[PDB]
Design a binder for this molecule. Structure first.
Ligand SMILES: NC(=O)C1=CN([C@@H]2O[C@H](COP(=O)(O)OP(=O)(O)OC[C@H]3O[C@@H](n4cnc5c(N)ncnc54)[C@H](OP(=O)(O)O)[C@@H]3O)[C@@H](O)[C@H]2O)C=CC1
Ligand SMILES: NC(=O)C1=CN([C@@H]2O[C@H](COP(=O)(O)OP(=O)(O)OC[C@H]3O[C@@H](n4cnc5c(N)ncnc54)[C@H](OP(=O)(O)O)[C@@H]3O)[C@@H](O)[C@H]2O)C=CC1
Ligand SMILES: Nc1nc(N)c2nc(CNc3ccc(C(=O)N[C@@H](CCC(=O)O)C(=O)O)cc3)cnc2n1
Ligand SMILES: Nc1nc(N)c2nc(CNc3ccc(C(=O)N[C@@H](CCC(=O)O)C(=O)O)cc3)cnc2n1
Ligand SMILES: Nc1nc2[nH]c3cccc(Sc4ccccc4)c3c2c(=O)[nH]1
Ligand SMILES: Nc1nc2[nH]c3cccc(Sc4ccccc4)c3c2c(=O)[nH]1
Ligand SMILES: O=c1ccn([C@H]2C[C@H](O)[C@@H](COP(=O)(O)O)O2)c(=O)[nH]1
Ligand SMILES: O=c1ccn([C@H]2C[C@H](O)[C@@H](COP(=O)(O)O)O2)c(=O)[nH]1
Lengths: 489, 491
């Protein structure tokens, strides 16, 4: 008699309003709902849930229906509705399904539910009916039997609404090839949330990367003196067609991403412009003491030299200081990339580099993310690869995933393309030794659905220089807590 | 009654000389032989094989030994051996292994052999005893039941000898999740696969072969610069191990002399393609004709001048280009010197990179670099690894050549920096097969890989700097590729 709950709920456990659904139509959720409930199977719904459904759908085709009212033409309650399933139906009736509140809370208190099939809607919506609070509730937001997630899907979206699917549970042909495999094969491996067998969420790539570097990396020294554990040659890829990979296992500093990127695009080399908006990510690397450690006593405090964005907009131009005007100097790699994207998308030379050996000594830091390449296919879908030489997995990586994915949206939009994928290529890939305990905590967190990032005022924005800080909404971002990690300078 | 043969052979099926083994000691192969034959099992050998084995090892421990001979103290033939095994031994005797020539040929004629366990020694050695010709032979060299390979390992080595293991054969919570998986598979013809019969695909060349299947089945058809038209994917990865052997691909013959000459040309900083052409390496010629130079708006270029590309940017990044005849010594950044310098002094530095992509000089080049960046890494055991990023990749023609080129550079660099080469890592942008290469590539996919060769640097003693290497300082050892497959270059 094991029973399974099938629900869609917002992060605050919201499920409905005005005897109806809080959110516009979720197509894929519906496909999911259909498939799960038939393989005959029994669905069991509360009085009012039956009404919510439009009549042409009301008898749920190819499934035994049950309503639990006391006033309609069908059982008196849930315990008596289980009886009906044992008494008759014992033949054919495979697994059962409960599909409104009060019928959910009924099933929880009577403790007959072994599994929960939960569509996590990432947005909050006005609601007047809620799913009961339960142990394992953390899977929804930051709010002895308990419900442990065993499955977590990729992020989907419909009508501007991001959503995940999770499932929670109460807690000699070629055997004569084996002796050879045996001898070819081989202390305590950490794994990100080991209880999740089916790891669809694309954020597992980042969580499994962290595990790999800690289990199989090699302890090394470095420029900073802090010490690392590293690997070399690592790969992640993030899909941009449904959702946006803003990491959920720790809050990513979104404003910083978006400001630094707009700062790159103007070709600005004054870190003070970032700092004065409360984005201090450059400050430790442009202090007097650090410019002097870089043999650049002539540099003003804040001046990053001819770095990142200077090279994007003015490659090979002679650098002076951060107040000087370079308009018309060097190669504008960004405009050329866009022009080629608009006029000839099959060209294979759509690249932008930040690596200029002639100028490395003049920069505060040698660039980390130093190359990106764009690719269009035959459906007008755009993808981007970025090659990063040196990757602080703790701190920089999540920020960088966001940064370059956002640039892919920005470029897709001015070129009249749909963004498809971000491909992340990593060289020296390291975890600072003093971030390890923090990262082990992070690996005990189950990811939440990815948000969507929208571009507002699309009508106004025609060229890449037209974007401002106020032209993006992040929708449905529900991360776990910030985890503090000190920057190795 | 099924039997298994266990052998090690050269490419010409050579197994013995002077009642001994042809090659120096192969440790892993001995491990392999021991682990396969005990799990009690019986081994069956010919008299002369019994006598090959040193005496301290002689009765092979923990195995029933049977010798076929007519002189000793033991059965008179193979049929007689298999009778022995059935009459007594039916208990605890699990599998039976045949381990000399002529015992191998009797076992193949009788037809009682179900699996062959063949260790493929990649070098030839003087041999006076051979393993019989058998259908499936083609796994060894370019020389009805057939023995088809089902398992093919990675390449190993010991004492300067590269080798493979292949195996031939005669011819609660799950339940609940199943439905949610079921619909995420559904949405979304006849898949092409490289040697599908091969179930355990350790040979690192399966990376290249599976990359060709993947582009063909899942890539999108597009136009391009050339007019020829391609199938493409975006963002592809391979990695090749360098500690044991060298990834010179075996499913078609790769042009070693071209790899090596071009790489040396790169290191010199040379931009004259005539110097390549004059040594019988014409890979640059179609891209430096008078005709191709004008279609690039460079009528002032002498035929063969590739402009300030590859090696020019490596040795003189940003220097002002004139022509292929000028001396640039001292001008621009010598990225290669710097990388080496950093590897010798500071192996944990994370800025060990070299790029040929210079957007200020791209129009002046005949061709924008394809392989445009490489970065180096040293771990805690003095092992050098290398990543190269290639923006555009002709999977049919250039990729194998590109794999060998940067792998060789890795060796060259590791040697002058006193490191051991470990791994070459290939990062690929626009990754594509030309449409007129497809039929040929599908043929190529029917060919199982052979063990990789080793590349030795000769005259290590005299070679202290990167500019010291010449064409005569390398040997390729044990290279046994399949035939060339002619594929024309899309101009
Ligand atoms: N997104 C989702 O996952 C889902 C959302 N919904 C939404 O939620 C709302 C419907 O849920 P809700 O309002 O809670 O109403 P329900 O559908 O749970 O129906 C409540 C009625 O069912 C009967 N009932 C429920 N529990 C008991 C009990 N323990 N003992 C006896 N009878 C019981 C009663 O009928 P009687 O009055 O006859 O005694 C009660 O009036 C709608 O807005 C609907 O759209 C519904 C299903 C799923
Ligand atoms: N690398 C490898 O895979 C292996 C290599 N080897 C090498 O091969 C050589 C040994 O092979 P090889 O020279 O062929 O000799 P074998 O070991 O096959 O033995 C030859 C002798 O065994 C007996 N014999 C063999 N076949 C028959 C038969 N069909 N019927 C009756 N008696 C038979 C005969 O002994 P009698 O004179 O008593 O009648 C014959 O003279 C050595 O150099 C050895 O190191 C051996 C094993 C493995
Ligand atoms: N995870 C999740 N997501 C939900 N939306 C959900 N909704 C409810 C209740 N609300 C309903 C709304 C519409 C229908 C309806 O007409 N459905 C057709 C759709 C067929 C198709 O489109 O394939 C069907 O069932 O074949 C049924 C119930 C209960 N649990 C739920 N759980
Ligand atoms: N594929 C293959 N490779 C071969 N070399 C091979 N050689 C022969 C004959 N030559 C032999 C010489 C010495 C031994 C010996 O003392 N071996 C130890 C290894 C101990 C260990 O390291 O475990 C053992 O097994 O305990 C065994 C065989 C026959 N078939 C063969 N087949
Ligand atoms: N060790 C370390 N040094 C960094 N310097 C940066 C400069 C700009 C952006 C970044 S990315 C970043 C910035 C703030 C917080 C996390 C990543 C870094 C960065 C980083 O991530 N790690
Ligand atoms: N389509 C295609 N065009 C090429 N132009 C080249 C110029 C120099 C080296 C190369 S590599 C190469 C290796 C073997 C044969 C031809 C080119 C290419 C090359 C290639 O491989 N494919
Ligand atoms: O976007 C960025 C910029 C910088 N870094 C960090 C990675 C290195 O830990 C740090 C120092 O660079 P190196 O000089 O060590 O490469 O820069 C990032 O991770 N992401
Ligand atoms: O080492 C090389 C050099 C060139 N090419 C090929 C890849 C491209 O198919 C062709 C030129 O096309 P574009 O990169 O120009 O699109 O050069 C390679 O594959 N490998």
């Amino acid at each position: 008699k094991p029973v399974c709950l099938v629900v869609a709920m917002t992060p605050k456990r919201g499920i409905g309003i005005n005897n109806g659904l809080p959110w516009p139509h979720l197509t894929t959720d519906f496909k999911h709902f259909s498939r799960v409930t038939k393989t005959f199977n029994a669905v069991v719904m509360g009085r009012k849930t039956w009404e919510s459904m439009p009549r042409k759908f009301r008898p749920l085709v190819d499934r035994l229906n049950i309503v639990v009212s006391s006033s309609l033409k069908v059982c008196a309650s849930l315990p008596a509705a289980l009886s009906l399933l044992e008494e008759e139906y014992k033949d054919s009736v495979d697994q059962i399904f409960v599909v409104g509140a009060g019928l959910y809370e009924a099933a929880l208190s009577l403790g007959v539910a072994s599994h929960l099939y939960i569509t996590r809607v990432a947005r909050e919506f006005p609601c007047d009916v809620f799913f009961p609070a339960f142990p394992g509730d953390d899977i929804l937001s930051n709010k002895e039997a308990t419900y442990r997630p065993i499955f977590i899907s990729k992020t989907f979206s419909d009508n501007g609404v991001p959503y995940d699917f999770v499932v929670l549970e109460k807690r000699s042909s070629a055997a004569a090839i084996a002796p050879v495999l045996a001898w070819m094969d081989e202390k305590e491996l950490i794994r990100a949330v080991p209880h999740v067998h089916f790891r669809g969420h694309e954020e597992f790539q980042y969580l499994d990367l962290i595990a790999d570097i800690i289990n199989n990396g090699r302890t090394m020294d470095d420029r900073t003196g802090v010490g690392v554990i590293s690997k070399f040659g690592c790969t992640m890829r993030y899909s941009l067609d449904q959702a946006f990979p803003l990491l959920t296992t720790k809050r990513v500093f979104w404003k910083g991403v978006l400001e630094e990127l707009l700062w790159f695009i103007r070709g600005d080399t004054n870190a003070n412009h970032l700092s004065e908006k409360g984005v201090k990510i450059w400050d430790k690397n442009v202090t007097r003491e650090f410019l002097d450690s870089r043999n650049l006593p002539h540099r003003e405090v804040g001046d990053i030299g001819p770095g990142y964005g200077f090279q994007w907009r003015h490659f090979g131009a002679a650098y002076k200081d951060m107040h000087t005007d370079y308009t018309g100097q060097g190669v504008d790699q960004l405009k050329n990339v866009i022009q080629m994207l608009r006029t000839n998308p099959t060209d294979r030379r759509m690249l932008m580099t930040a690596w200029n050996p002639a100028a490395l000594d003049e920069m505060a830091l040698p660039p980390c993310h130093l190359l990106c390449q764009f690719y269009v296919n035959d459906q007008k879908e755009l993808s981007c690869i970025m090659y990063q030489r040196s990757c602080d997995v703790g701190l920089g990586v999540p920020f960088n995933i966001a940064s370059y994915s956002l640039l892919t949206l920005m470029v897709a939009h001015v070129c009249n393309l749909k963004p498809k994928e971000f491909i992340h290529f990593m060289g020296n890939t390291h975890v600072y030794t003093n971030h390890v305990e923090a990262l082990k905590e992070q690996l005990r967190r189950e990811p939440r659905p990815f948000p969507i990032v929208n571009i507002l005022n699309k009508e106004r924005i025609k060229e890449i220089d037209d974007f401002t800080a106020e032209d993006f909404e992040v929708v449905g971002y529900v991360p776990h807590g910030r985890i503090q990690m000190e920057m190795a300078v």
